[PDB]
Amino acid sequence: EYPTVSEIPVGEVRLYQIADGVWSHIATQSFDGAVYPSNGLIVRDGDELLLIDTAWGAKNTAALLAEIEKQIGLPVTRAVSTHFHDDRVGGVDVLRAAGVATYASPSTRRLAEVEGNEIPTHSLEGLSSSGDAVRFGPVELFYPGAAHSTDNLVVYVPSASVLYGGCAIYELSRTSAGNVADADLAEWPTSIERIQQHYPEAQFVIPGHGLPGGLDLLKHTTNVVKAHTNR
Numbered sequence: 450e451y452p453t454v455s456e457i458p459v460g461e462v463r464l465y466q467i468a469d470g471v472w473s474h475i476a477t478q479s480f481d482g483a484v485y486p487s488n489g490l491i492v493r494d495g496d497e498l499l500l501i502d503t504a505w506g507a508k509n510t511a512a513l514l515a516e517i518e519k520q521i522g523l524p525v526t527r528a529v530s531t532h533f534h535d536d537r538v539g540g541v542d543v544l545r546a547a548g549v550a551t552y553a554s555p556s557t558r559r560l561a562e563v564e565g566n567e568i569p570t571h572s573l574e575g576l577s578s579s580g581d582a583v584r585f586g587p588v589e590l591f592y593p594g595a596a597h598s599t600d601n602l603v604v605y606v607p608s609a610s611v612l613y614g615g616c617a618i619y620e621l622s623r624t625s626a627g628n629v630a631d632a633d634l635a636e637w638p639t640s641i642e643r644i645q646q647h648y649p650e651a652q653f654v655i656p657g658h659g660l661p662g663g664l665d666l667l668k669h670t671t672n673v674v675k676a677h678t679n680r
């Protein structure tokens with residue numbers, strides 16, 4: 450079954466096959482005295498792999514590359530970071546030193562620079578306005594609007610009906626808000642609606658942290674964000 454936070458030592462990385470040529474990667478990290486799991490995606494791209502998000506830090510991301518080589522044996526040639534925070538760009542330098550072409554939107558690149566986080570080298574154009582979508586190899590990238598962060602992207606894999614929401618989507622077990630210092634609470638439910646409207650066909654939805662589900666994860670996140678807004 451899908452690996453949970455309690456089953457993954459910090460420093461180790463697990464892969465979970467969703468579909469032909471589609472996996473999530475799962476890692477864990479301490480933050481503020483608690484241990485969190487964290488998800489990203491791996492999508493096969495001919496005889497190469499596209500990586501979505503690092504494994505939250507240099508050590509984990511090196512383990513992630515080692516696990517991919519062991520379990521899959523295809524080269525990661527490009528990676529996309531879905532926003533500027535350390536669980537999505539922490540490890541970009543590891544990726545770059547391994548020869549991976551790292552990408553993020555100009556918004557994410559500017560904010561990472563401001564924050565002191567690692568900065569993906571390449572820039573994704575065409576994603577600066579809410580509702581914008583661009584094809585990137587075997588995925589579509591979508592900018593739904595400000596939500597968990599002003600730059601957050603979601604990623605859809607049309608071949609597998611997989612929607613990766615990143616930190617803009619919460620798992621069901623999370624009934625209170627995560628970090629919101631960088632969020633746009635006022636716009637977050639509207640951005641989720643844009644996701645629903647653009648990817649109504651999605652079958653497997655992956656939050657930034659925790660267990661995947663279906664499109665009900667978008668309603669769940671809306672419920673939680675609105676409850677937080679009101680308290």
Ligand SMILES: C=C(C(=O)O)[C@@H](C)[C@H]1O[B-](O)(O)c2ccccc21
Binds near residue numbers: 480485535616626629
């Ligand atoms: C679940 C989270 C959230 O929803 O905030 C947190 C714990 C996770 O997400 B994040 O991109 O904000 C981040 C940054 C740096 C460390 C950890 C995180």
Ligand SMILES: [Zn+2]
Binds near residue numbers: 532597616
């Ligand atoms: Zn974040």
Ligand SMILES: [Zn+2]
Binds near residue numbers: 536616657658
């Ligand atoms: Zn996160």
